[PDB]
């Protein structure tokens, strides 16, 4: 992500993030996924029910092909939340349409997101260029 | 053949649908032969007969006062001047266990003294439930605790429907040698009903439980084909 | 199509809110009685009155139907389950949203009805004297959050004809015209409050009248999702245990 690469250029950052999910199956495909967000300090849910009991989104990709999950706060200084996707329902399709699809996850920061203490990134390494 | 006019809307009211005092119990005060009891205790049961049970189970909750009439006579239909005591044992009160039990003197048990020669004694029992209405269907357990009992009785048995008993006896000192047949007629008054339900379609197997036989009977009689009339 | 957010729960549902209001009565808080004038029963917020999405039942061609006793369906589920397990008295309405995920090539019709005092009957082969076969086991009278499949849906497992179940607050799910049913059931009982663990105020039945049909290649089971939202829930007599 662009936010993930820019955070590498800084030491501290905090703010809310948004995560958009795009379902890219056929128009005839339908079903429900459960997008659950577990706050920091808690292990990821082990069952769909435990995920449902927390902050979650029952995403019916038969109705809307895109859904946005706003992460309230991250604040990684120099644990962390977890997003889980659960098969709420089966993947329902009529005949003659692909039974496998893809979800595209898009991450970004919100306007309250801030950075601090510029630091040279480690994503690149100087060699005999 | 055809009635082009409209009937009355009042004959279909709930109040009228549950009117017309009907036989709810036939008790016999046996005092002869092998049973010299001289008394009998009839638990007030609005659902003694499947007709009235099906009519009442049309509704979930019902609240009403009841007028009881006792048509008593001997086996040969004669009504001599035998003095009877119709004691209403309210819910929570102990019932008699003998002809001359002490419970017959309990002043808090409303008692009616009437001879067989008199017109049928008639009393009004008010709405006796701790709840705001009787429940002909109680999806629950009156007990408290976990209900994994093997024979899962006590399920669906609402305790609030208890209306009491009618203990009837002759005021004799010993056995009279005459059996008395008492027909208890009950009239539903000021009836109010809630949550209408489907009328029972399967034959009633037992009392107090909606148990039905394994051989389901169709609600509608059969036809030859779906196109025959 | 919109996204109803109640508490931390969000469901995807269509607009126009074609909701069935049971007996034209909205779930309301009980006016303070004498027993409640002294303890002031607990009225939980969207923390408890949120959307509970149960496990989805798989509607198949031979499915007879399902039912859930509702004070019981959430007795072991989240903070509502906590409040029900640890309070003496309970009172609540419910918003029930039954959703099917079927293609336009699936067919079938569901009758979604909310049956107050849905007393389950046992089906005995013969009248035996006060035997176990005369009463339903607790697994059938209180099926929990998983629901119970109907044994004889024609008689609602209660001796009453299914054809007349529409006398109850009901809603059709005809797969060709709609796949969502929303029934709002207020608190209906002969008492202002009652035991959430003993008494089940009502049952929600989902019965396939027209059996599910599809041609080879379609998804052989239509998922039926039940979302529950307690409305105006109240509790009294908190225990510790």
From TrEMBL, chain A:
Cysteine protease that cleaves viral polyprotein and specific host proteins. It is responsible for the autocatalytic cleavage between the P1 and P2 regions, which is the first cleavage occurring in the polyprotein. Also cleaves the host translation initiation factor EIF4G1, in order to shut down the capped cellular mRNA translation. Inhibits the host nucleus-cytoplasm protein and RNA trafficking by cleaving host members of the nuclear pores. Counteracts stress granule formation probably by antagonizing its assembly or promoting its dissassembly. It is found in: Host cytoplasmic vesicle membrane; Host nucleus; Virion. The chain holds residues 422 to 563 of 2201 of the full protein. This is Genome polyprotein. Belongs to the picornaviruses polyprotein family. Transmembrane segments: none annotated. It comes from Coxsackievirus A6. Interacts with RNA-directed RNA polymerase.
TrEMBL record, chain B:
GO terms for biological process: symbiont entry into host cell; virion attachment to host cell. The keyword Glycosyltransferase does not apply. It comes from the Viruses. Residues 1-198 form the Picornavirus capsid VP1 domain. GO terms for cellular component: host cell; virion component. It is found in: Host cytoplasm; Virion. Its main location: host cell. The keyword Transmembrane helix does not apply. Keywords: Capsid protein, Host cytoplasm, Host-virus interaction, Lipoprotein, Myristate, T=pseudo3 icosahedral capsid protein, Viral attachment to host cell, Virion, Virus entry into host cell. This is Genome polyprotein. The chain holds residues 63 to 291 of 305 of the full protein.
UniProtKB/TrEMBL annotation, chain C:
It is found in: Host cytoplasmic vesicle membrane; Host nucleus; Virion. Homodimer. Interacts with host GBF1. Interacts (via GOLD domain) with host ACBD3 (via GOLD domain); this interaction allows the formation of a viral protein 3A/ACBD3 heterotetramer with a 2:2 stoichiometry, which will stimulate the recruitment of host PI4KB in order to synthesize PI4P at the viral RNA replication sites. Belongs to the picornaviruses polyprotein family. Localizes the viral replication complex to the surface of membranous vesicles. It inhibits host cell endoplasmic reticulum-to-Golgi apparatus transport and causes the disassembly of the Golgi complex, possibly through GBF1 interaction. This would result in depletion of MHC, trail receptors and IFN receptors at the host cell surface. Plays an essential role in viral RNA replication by recruiting ACBD3 and PI4KB at the viral replication sites, thereby allowing the formation of the rearranged membranous structures where viral replication takes place. This is Genome polyprotein. It comes from Coxsackievirus A6. The lineage of its organism: Viruses, Riboviria, Orthornavirae, Pisuviricota, Pisoniviricetes.
């Amino acid at each position: 992500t662009m936010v993930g690469q820019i955070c590498r250029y800084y030491t501290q950052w905090s703010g809310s993030l948004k995560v958009t999910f795009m379902f890219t199956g056929s128009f005839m495909a339908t079903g429900k996924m459960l997008i659950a967000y577990t706050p920091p300090g808690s292990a990821q849910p082990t069952t769909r029910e435990a995920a449902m009991l927390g902050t979650h989104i029952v995403w019916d990709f038969g109705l809307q092909s895109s859904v946005t999950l706003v992460i309230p706060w991250i604040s990684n200084t120099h644990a962390t939340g977890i997003v889980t996707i659960w098969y709420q329902t089966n993947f329902v399709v009529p005949p003659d349409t692909p039974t496998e699809a893809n979800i595209i996850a898009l991450g970004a920061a919100q306007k309250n997101f801030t950075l601090k203490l510029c630091k040279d990134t480690d994503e690149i390494q100087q060699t005999a260029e | 053949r055809c009635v082009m006019n409209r009937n009355g809307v009042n004959e279909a009211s709930v109040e009228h649908f549950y009117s017309r005092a009907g036989l709810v119990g036939v008790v016999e005060v046996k005092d002869s032969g092998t049973s010299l009891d001289g008394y009998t205790v009839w638990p007030i049961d609005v659902m003694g007969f499947v007709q009235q049970r099906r009519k009442l189970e049309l509704s979930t909750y019902m609240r009403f006062d009841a007028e009881f009439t006792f048509v008593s006579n001997l086996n040969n239909s004669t009504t001599p001047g035998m003095l009877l005591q119709y004691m209403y044992v309210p819910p929570g009160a102990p019932k008699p266990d003998s002809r001359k039990s002490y419970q017959w003197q309990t002043a808090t048990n409303p008692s009616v003294f009437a001879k067989l020669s008199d017109p049928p004694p008639q009393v009004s029992v008010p709405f006796m439930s701790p709840a705001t209405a009787y429940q002909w269907f109680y999806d629950g357990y009156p007990t408290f605790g976990e209900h994994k009992q093997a024979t899962n009785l006590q399920y669906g048995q609402c305790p609030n429907n208890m209306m009491g008993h009618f203990a009837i006896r002759t005021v004799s000192e010993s056995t009279t040698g005459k059996n008395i047949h008492v027909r208890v007629y009950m009239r539903i008054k000021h009836v109010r009903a809630w949550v209408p339900r489907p009328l029972r379609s399967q034959a009633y197997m037992v009392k107090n439980y909606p148990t039905y036989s394994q051989t389901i009977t169709n609600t509608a009689t059969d036809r030859a084909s779906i196109t025959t009339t | 199509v919109a996204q109803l957010t109640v508490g931390n729960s969000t469901i995807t549902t269509q607009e126009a809110a074609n909701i069935v209001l049971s007996y034209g009565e909205w779930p309301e808080y009980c006016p303070s009685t004498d027993a409640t004038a002294v303890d002031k029963p607990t009225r939980p917020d969207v923390s408890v009155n949120r959307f509970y999405t149960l496990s989805t039942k798989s509607w198949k061609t031979e499915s007879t139907g399902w039912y859930w006793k509702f004070p019981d369906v959430l007795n072991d589920t989240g903070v509502f389950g906590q409040n029900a397990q640890f309070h003496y008295l309970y009172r609540s309405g419910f918003c029930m949203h039954v959703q099917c995920n079927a293609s336009k090539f699936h067919q079938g019709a569901l009758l979604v009805a909310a049956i107050p005092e849905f007393v389950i009957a046992a089906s005995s082969p013969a009248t035996k004297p006060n035997s176990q076969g005369l009463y339903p086991d607790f697994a059938h009278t209180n099926p929990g959050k998983d629901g119970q499949e109907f044994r004889d849906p024609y008689v609602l497992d209660a001796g009453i004809p299914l054809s007349q179940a529409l006398i109850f607050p009901h809603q059709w799910i005809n797969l060709r015209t709609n796949n969502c049913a929303t029934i709002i059931m207020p608190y209906i009982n002969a008492l202002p409050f009652d035991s959430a663990l003993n008494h089940s105020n009502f049952g929600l039945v989902v019965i396939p009248i027209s059996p599910l049909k599809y041609c080879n290649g379609a998804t052989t089971e239509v998922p039926i999702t039940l979302t529950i939202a307690p409305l105006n829930s109240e509790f009294s007599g908190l225990r510790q245990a």
